[PDB]
Symmetry: D2
Subunit: 441 residues, 4 copies
Amino acid sequence: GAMNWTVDIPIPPLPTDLRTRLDAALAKPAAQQPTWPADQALAMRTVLESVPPVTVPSEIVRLQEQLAQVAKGEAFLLQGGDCAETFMDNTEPHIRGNVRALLQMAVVLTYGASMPVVKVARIAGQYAKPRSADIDALGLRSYRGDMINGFAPDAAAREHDPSRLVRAYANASAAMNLVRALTSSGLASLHLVHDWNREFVRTSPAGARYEALATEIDRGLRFMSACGVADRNLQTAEIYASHEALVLDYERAMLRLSDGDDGEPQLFDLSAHTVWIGERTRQIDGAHIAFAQVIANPVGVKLGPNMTPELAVEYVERLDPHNKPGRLTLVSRMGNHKVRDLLPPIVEKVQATGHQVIWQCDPMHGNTHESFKTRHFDRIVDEVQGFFEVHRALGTHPGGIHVEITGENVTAGRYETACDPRLNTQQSLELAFLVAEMLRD
Amino acid sequence: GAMNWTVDIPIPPLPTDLRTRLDAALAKPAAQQPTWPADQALAMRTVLESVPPVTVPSEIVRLQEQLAQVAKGEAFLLQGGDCAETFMDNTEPHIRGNVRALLQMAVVLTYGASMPVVKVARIAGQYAKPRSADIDALGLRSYRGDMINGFAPDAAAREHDPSRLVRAYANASAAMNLVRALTSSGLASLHLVHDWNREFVRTSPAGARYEALATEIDRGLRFMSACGVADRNLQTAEIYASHEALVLDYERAMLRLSDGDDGEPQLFDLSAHTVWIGERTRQIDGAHIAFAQVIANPVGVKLGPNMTPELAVEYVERLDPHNKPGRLTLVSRMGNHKVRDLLPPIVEKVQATGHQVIWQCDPMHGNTHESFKTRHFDRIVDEVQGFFEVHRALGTHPGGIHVEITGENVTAGRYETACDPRLNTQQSLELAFLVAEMLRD
Amino acid sequence: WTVDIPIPSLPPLPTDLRTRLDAALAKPAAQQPTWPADQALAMRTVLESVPPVTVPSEIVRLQEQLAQVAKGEAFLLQGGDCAETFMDNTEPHIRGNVRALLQMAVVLTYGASMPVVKVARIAGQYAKPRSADIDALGLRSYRGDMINGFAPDAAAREHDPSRLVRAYANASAAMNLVRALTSSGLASLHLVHDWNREFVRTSPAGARYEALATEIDRGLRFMSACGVADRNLQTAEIYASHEALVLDYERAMLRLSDGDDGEPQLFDLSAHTVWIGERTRQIDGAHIAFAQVIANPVGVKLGPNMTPELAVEYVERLDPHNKPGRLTLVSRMGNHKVRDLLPPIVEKVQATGHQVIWQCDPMHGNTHESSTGFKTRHFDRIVDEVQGFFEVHRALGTHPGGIHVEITGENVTYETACDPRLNTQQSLELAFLVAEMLRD
Amino acid sequence: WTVDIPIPSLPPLPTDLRTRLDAALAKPAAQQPTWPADQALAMRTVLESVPPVTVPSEIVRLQEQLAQVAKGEAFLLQGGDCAETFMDNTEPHIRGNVRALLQMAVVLTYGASMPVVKVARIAGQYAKPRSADIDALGLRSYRGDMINGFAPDAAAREHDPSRLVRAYANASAAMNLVRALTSSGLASLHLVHDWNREFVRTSPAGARYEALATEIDRGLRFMSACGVADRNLQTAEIYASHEALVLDYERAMLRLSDGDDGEPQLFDLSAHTVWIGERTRQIDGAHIAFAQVIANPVGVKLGPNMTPELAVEYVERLDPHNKPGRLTLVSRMGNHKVRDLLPPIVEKVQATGHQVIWQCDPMHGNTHESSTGFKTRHFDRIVDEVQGFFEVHRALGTHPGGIHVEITGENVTYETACDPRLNTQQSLELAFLVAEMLRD
Ligand SMILES: N[C@@H](Cc1ccccc1)C(=O)O
Ligand SMILES: N[C@@H](Cc1ccccc1)C(=O)O
Ligand SMILES: N[C@@H](Cc1ccccc1)C(=O)O
Ligand SMILES: N[C@@H](Cc1ccccc1)C(=O)O
Ligand SMILES: N[C@@H](Cc1ccccc1)C(=O)O
Ligand SMILES: N[C@@H](Cc1ccccc1)C(=O)O
Ligand SMILES: N[C@@H](Cc1ccccc1)C(=O)O
Ligand SMILES: N[C@@H](Cc1ccccc1)C(=O)O
Ligand SMILES: N[C@@H](Cc1ccccc1)C(=O)O
Ligand SMILES: N[C@@H](Cc1ccccc1)C(=O)O
C-alpha cells in the first residue's frame, strides 16, 4: 500500500452485428478524447469491462417510458446537479447536498407543471469535460475532469492518466450506491423535502416572492394527506444518473448486452441511465453520435447557436430512427438574447418530421460574460423564459430544463467549483420557483 | 291493491340490564311525540322490529373513530342535507342532488381545513320535525313531517297516522341504498366532483370571488395526480346518515343489539349512524336524553341561547360518561348577534371538564327574521364567522358545521321545501367557500 | 292483522326507446300474473320514479368482469335462496346467505386460481312460474310473494299488484344491507375463512376437506407474511340477481343511463344481472324481447329439450353485438343427460364466433321427489352434473364458466316456502368438491 | 499486470464518542492483520470520509424487523458466499447469490407462514481468521482479500493495507448492484418462483418437492386472483452483512447518525448487521467492545465450548438496554452435539429476560474433511443440525429464529477460494427441507 491502492488486471462474445456496428462507430474520428497510450487504456478497459454496473437495463427501459410521457407533453424533465463531479468532493454530505437540492426543485416544479417531473441528476460519472484550447490561461495543459487529469495547477498533475478511468468508476459506483440509499430512505419523503423549502422561504432575504407559492404548495401537500393518502409513493422516489458521454474509452468499457425479455439483445451503456453529447463533440458523422446510435439508452444532444433546422432534423433521424418518443432529447443552449429568434425555426422543421423529441432548455452554457467566469442570474432566467415563449407560440411542449447547481452555497470569496460559477443551492431553488410560475401561465 | 300496499304484521331477548334501562328511559316524559294510539303504534313497531337495518354497528363504530379525530381537532365535521325529507321527493335525482351538493362542500372544506372532513348527510330518515304551536297559521294541526302526518293543508291529511312509521322506513332504506350505490360509484371521484365546482365558478354571477381558491384547489388535485396517486381513495368515499331522534316509537323499533367483538353487547340505533336531539326535546331528565344514553351511537345535542355553561356541562357528563372523545357533539345555534357573547363562557366551562366534544356550528336555526320564513345569507355566514372567532380566541377547535340545503336551486317564485327556506345548492357551496377561508386564517 | 300503506311522475323515458319497448312487450308473455291492467298501471307508475336497486356504473362494471369470466380467466358463482319470501326478508337471513356465498367464493377462488365474480340470488327473487294452474290443495297456485301469498287460503292466493311495491321495498331494503355488510368486516377474507376452518372441525365430512382447508389457510397466511394491503382488495363486490319473470315489475324498473359514458341505453335497475327461465324463454315471446332491449348482462336457462340450433338463435338475438360475457347460457340438463346433451350445443354455439359464459345449474335438473311426501333433490346427482359439466367442457377445450346454486345460511332440511335444495353445510361442501374439479 | 491508483479529512467524530471508541479498541484484538500502523492510518483516513455502504435509517429499520424475528413472528435468513473474492466481485456472481437467496426466501416465507428478513453475506465478507499461521504450502496463510491475496506466492501473501480501500470500492460497487437488482424485476415474487418451479422439473430430487412447489404456486396464484397490488409489497429488501473481523476497516466506516431521530449514536456503515466470529469473541477482547459501541444489530457465533454462563455474559454486554432482536446468538455446534449442548444455553439465556434471536448455523459445525484431498461438508449432517436445532427449541417452546448458510448461485463442486459448502441447487433443496420443519 505504497501511497495508493493497487487493482490487478483480469488475467461471452457479442452478436456479430453489434460487434461490427460498435467497431464501425469507434473507427470514426472522435473529438476531445484524452491522449494517453492505447496499450494502457486497453488494460483499464479490461478491468472495467467486468465490474459491477452503475445502472441496469430494466431501470433504463423504465426511464425510457417515463421520458416518453415527458416527450408527449404529459410530464416534465428536471435534469441537474454538479457542473463537474470531483473525486475530492465525492463525499456523503456533497452527494446528500445535490439530492436535497434536486428534490426541492422537483416538488416546486411538479406543483407548477401540475404533472410528474423526471429527476435526472448530473452525477455518478460527470468526471470529464471538453475544452476549446489545449493550453489554458496559466500555460498548462487544460484540466479536463478528474477522469482524465488533475485540477492542481502543475504539469505533473495535468498529464493524462489512464488509471483515472478506474478511479472514476470506483467513485461513480460509490456515489450511486448512496443515491439509491438516500432516495429510498426518508430523505425523499415529499414533506420532509418541502419543510426545507419553507425554511429557505423564511430565511431567504429574497423569499417574500415565493412565500405565496410555497404556502399554496404546502396546502396541496396537507390536502393530499387529508384525502387519506399515506406516503405508503406514493411511488418510491427515483433519481436517474447521467453525464456527458465524452470519454469513449470509459463509455465503451461500461457497455453491457441485454438478455432478451425486451425484443432482441442490444447494447446498453451502464455507466448511467441517460447520457448526452456535447456541443464540441456532436460531429454528425462523429464517433460520439455513432456511439449514441449503438446504445439503447435515452440520449440528449446539445444544440448551439450555429444549429440549423436541417442539421437538427438529421440528428433526430439518426438518433431516433424507430420513432420512439423520448429516446432523443434536444437540449437548447442558445443564450437569452438569441434563443427567441433561433429556436422557433428549429422547432417547426423538427415537429414536422413526425418524431417527438423532448425540448429541454439549457440556460447555462449559453450565457457567459466572463466577469473567473461570471454568469448573471437574470440572464439564465431570461433564456428559460424565452424558451417557454417559443413553445407557447408554436403550441409545442417545453419539455424540461438542464441546470448546473450544487449543495454548498457558493458566491473572490467563495469560488469552490472545479469549473464554472453556476447557480448555488439557493439560486437554483429560486430558479425552480420562477420556472414554476412559467408553467402556471 | 286497493290504492295502497298492504304489509302484514309478523304473527331472542334483551339482556336484563339493557331492558331495564331502555324501559326506564322511555318511562320518562317525552316532548313532541305524535298522538296516535299505542295499540297501533305497537303493531308498526313490531313490523319494524325485524326489518333490515338502515346502518350496521361496524359503520357506527368506524364513525365513532373518525369523529374522535374531529373532536381531537384533527378533522372537520360537515353535516348537511335536506331541511326535511319528504316521501314525495324521495327520488333518484333528489338524492343524487344532495350528495353532489354535500360532496362539493367537502372538497372545498377539506382543502380549506387541510385535514379530513367527515360527511354526514341529513338523509334516510329526516322525516319528523318538532313544532311549537299544535295549531298552525291556517287553523290546522301543524305538519310534523311525513313520518307523522301530511303536508297537504287539510285536517284529513294532518291526522297522525301510525302507518307512516313503516312508510318512513321503506323510503329511508331505499334512499340509503342509493347513497351507498352512489358514493361507491364514480359519483364520488374527487375530480368528477371538482369539475362541478369549477363549473359553478364560471357560471355563477358571484363566482369571481372563488375563481381564486377553486383554481388553487384544482392545482392541489392535479398535483396529487402528479405525485403518482391513483384514485385507486384513495379511501372509498363515505357518507353517513343522520336525523333528529324525535319519534321515539320509530327510534326504538330500530334498535338492535351488538354481538360481542367490541367489548360487551349493547344497543345500537340502526335507523342511522349518528342522531341528535333538538332544542325542544332535550329536557335533561327527558326521555330523549335518556334514550341518547342507552344507545351506542354518536349523538349531538342542540344548544340554544338560553343554554347555561352549567347545563351544557350536565349534558356532557350524562351523554359522555366514559370520556370517549367524539361520542358527543354540542351543536351551537345562538344567532350571529348573540353567538359571540353567549358561546365563549359555555366553551370554557366545558373544556374544563376534561371531556372533548365536537363543537359544531348550526348557523341556520338561530337566525330567522320571518320576511314565508325568510333567512338572510349574510346572517348565516356571520354566525359561523363568530363561531370561529370564539374558538380561535380560547384556542379550542371549531369542530364542524350543520347546514340545511338542497340540490334543486330554490329562490314568491321558487318555494319548494316542505318546511323552511334555507340555503340553495348554490348558496351552500358558496358558504363552503367562505367557511374554507375561515379555516385558512 | 295487516296494514295498508298509501301512495308526481318524473319525466318519462325517451319516446324512441319507448316505442321499442312497446313493440317488444307486445309479444305474448308466459307465466304472467292475472291482475287488472289498470291497477297494474298504477303500481308501475309508483315504481317508475322510485330509487333504483342497482345503478348503471355497477352493471357496466359487472359486464366487464363477466367478459373475463367468458374469456376463461375468471369464474362465475351464482347462488342464493330458491325463493325469497317477504317474511324471511330479515337481517339474519340475508347475513346468512351472504355468508354462505362468500365462504363458497373463498374456496372456489383458491381452487380455480382465478377471480370469482360473486352474483347473489337476492333482492328480487319473489316470483316463480307454475306448471300447475290449480295446486294440490285445490287453491290458485302460489306464484311468489311478488304475485300472491303462501297462506293456503283463497283470499291470499289472489294476485295483488300492490305486491309489486312491496316487492320493491324489500328488494331495496335487502340490497341496502348486502351493500353494508359486503363493505364492512363481513366480507373480510380472513374472517370469512375462519368460518370454513370451523366447518372442518365441526363437520363429520371434515377429514375429507381438512387437507385443502389447511392449504387455503396457508395461502392466506402466505400473503399476510408478504405484507399485502388487506386494505382489498375489492372488499368483496356481491352483485344482485333474480329470474326476470313478472314483466310489469321489470319494466317499471327500466331506467336510462345519464350518458356521460357511451350513449343513452336502457338498463333494468331492479338488479344487476337477470335471467330468463326454462318456461318463459319462448324465442318470439316477450321475455327474450325484454332481454334484447335492456343492457344488463343476461342469462338463459337451457334444458333437455334444447336444440343446438335454437341455442344459436339465442346467441344472435341476445348478443347481436358480440360483447363477450353479455350472455351466459346456463345449463340444467341432469347428470344422466348432461354428458350426452351438452356438447353438441357448445360446439354449435362456439362456432358462431360469439363468446358466451357457460354456467352450470345442477339444481333443477336433479330432483327425485321423495317417498315421504316431501319433494327433494339428491346431493350426489348434483355433484355429478357439475362433474360431467366439467368433463364435457374439458373435452372440447372450452371454458366451464361457473355454477348456479340454490342454497341457504340456515342449516335446514324443510323450512323453505318453495323447492328443496342444499343447506349451508351442503353448499360449502359442494364448493370444495367443485374446487378439486378446477385443479385438474 | 496490476495498476496502482492514487489518493481533505471532513470533521472527525465527536470527542466524547471517540474516547469511548479508543477505550474500547485498546483491548487486545485477535486475528488482526500485521501491517504498519502508519500505513493502516493513512487508509483509515481515506475511508473516514468515503460514502457509506449502508445508511442509518436502513439499520434502524432492519432492527425493527429483527425485533419481530425475535418476538417469534418472523424468520431470519442469512446466506451468501463463504468468502467474497475481489475477482468474482462481478455482475453474474452477485446476480447469482441474490437469486439463490430470494428463491430460498420464497419457500421459507410460505413454510413459516411469516415474513422472512433477508440478510445477505455480501459486500464486505473479505477477511477470515486462520488457526494456521503457516499454511500447507509453507506460505503466510491467506486471510481474505481485505488482507492479502490467494496467489500462492510470498509477495502476494504479505498484508497490504491498500486492500482496505480496494475492499471498500468493491463493497460499495456490489451494494450498488443488489440495490439495483432488488428494486427491479429480479426480486419479483412471481419471476422468482419461476426459477423454483423449473428446479422441480429439472432436478432428480424433484418428485420429493413438486408437491410443495405446486402449493406455493397456488398460493401465488391465489393472491393474484384476489387482486393484490404486485405493485409490494416491500419489493424485496435485501440487507448486507459480513463477519466484522479486520477492525481497522470497521472503525473507519463508523459514522454518526444526524440525530433528527433519537440521539447521536455510532453506526458501522460498512454494512447493515455484522457478527463476531468463534475465534474473536473473547469477552474482554476488542471485538465485543466494538459491538457494544456500534448501534447495528449484532450477532455472535456460539460453538461447542460455549458455557451458558458466558452466553449470558454476551446477553449483558451486547444488549444491556434490552432491545429485542439487537443481539442474535448464532449456534454452530454440530448435529451430533446440537441436541445435547444447545438447550442448557437457551434456558439460561431466556431466563435473563432479554429477547435474543436464535439463529442456526449448520455450516461450520458440520465438516468432514474428505479422503481425496479436498476439504468437504456433508449435506445430511447439515440438515440434521437444523432439524435438532428446531427440536431443541420446539421442546423449550422458544422460537427457532433462522439459519445462516454459506451458499452460491453458480452450481459448483470446487471453484471457491475458501471453505466448502452447498451449491445453488443444494441450498434451495435445504430451504424446502427447512420449510417442512416450520409447518410442524
Ligand atoms: N474519492 C476518494 C475516495 C474513494 C476511493 C475509492 C472509491 C470511492 C471513493 C478517492 O478517489 O481517493
Ligand atoms: N411520490 C413523489 C415523491 C417525491 C416528490 C418530489 C420530491 C421527492 C419525492 C414522486 O415520486 O415524485
Ligand atoms: N467493451 C467491448 C464491447 C463489449 C460490450 C459488452 C460485452 C462484451 C464486449 C469493446 O469496447 O469492444
Ligand atoms: N316515496 C314513494 C315511493 C316509495 C314507496 C316505498 C318505498 C320507497 C319509495 C311512496 O312512499 O309512496
Ligand atoms: N379520498 C377522498 C375522496 C373524496 C373527497 C371529497 C369528496 C368526495 C370524495 C375522501 O374520502 O375524502
Ligand atoms: N324494540 C324493543 C327493544 C329491543 C331492541 C332490540 C332487540 C330486541 C328488543 C323495545 O322497544 O322495547
Ligand atoms: N319484510 C316485511 C316488512 C318490510 C316491509 C318493507 C320493506 C322491508 C320489510 C314485509 O315485507 O312485509
Ligand atoms: N377482494 C376479495 C375479497 C374476498 C374474496 C373472496 C371471498 C370473500 C372476500 C374479492 O372480492 O374477491
Ligand atoms: N473487482 C476488481 C475490479 C474492481 C475495482 C473496484 C471496484 C470494483 C471492482 C477488483 O476489485 O480488483
Ligand atoms: N415483498 C416481498 C417480495 C419477495 C418475497 C420473497 C421473495 C422475493 C420477493 C418481500 O420482500 O418479502
